[PDB]
Amino acid sequence: YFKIYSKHTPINLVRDLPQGFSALEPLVDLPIGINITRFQTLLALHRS
Amino acid sequence: LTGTGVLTESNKKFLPFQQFGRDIADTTDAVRDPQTLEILDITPCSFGGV
Numbered sequence A: 001y002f003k004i005y006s007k008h009t010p011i012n013l014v015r016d017l018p019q020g021f022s023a024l025e026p027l028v029d030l031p032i033g034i035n036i037t038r039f040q041t042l043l044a045l046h047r048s
Numbered sequence B: 001l002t003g004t005g006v007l008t009e010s011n012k013k014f015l016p017f018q019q020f021g022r023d024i025a026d027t028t029d030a031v032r033d034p035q036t037l038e039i040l041d042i043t044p045c046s047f048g049g050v
């Protein structure tokens, strides 16, 4: 069972993590049923 | 989810992943109606000693 908990927070700090409290609400409970041991996030390039 | 209690209109605002609410004794004291998505408090029926 793949659980997605999510929270969106308006912040204005430049560099590091902000210091505060914000609980993440569950968004999507996703039925995959597969083995996961390694992950990788996706970024986007800018071309000019 | 079966039970017996007085149903009243509730001021609690459930998050969309929440269906019911539990009290100290884990009895359902608030419930969301599955047809019209509104919250109802469930105060128990009166108990007395005769």
Ligand SMILES: *[C@@H]1O[C@H](CO)[C@@H](O)[C@H](O)[C@H]1NC(C)=O
Pocket (backbone or CB within 6 Å): B034, B035, B036
């Ligand atoms: C039927 O149920 C859905 C959610 O369960 C609700 O959004 C909808 O208003 C209901 N239809 C009627 C006619 O009440």
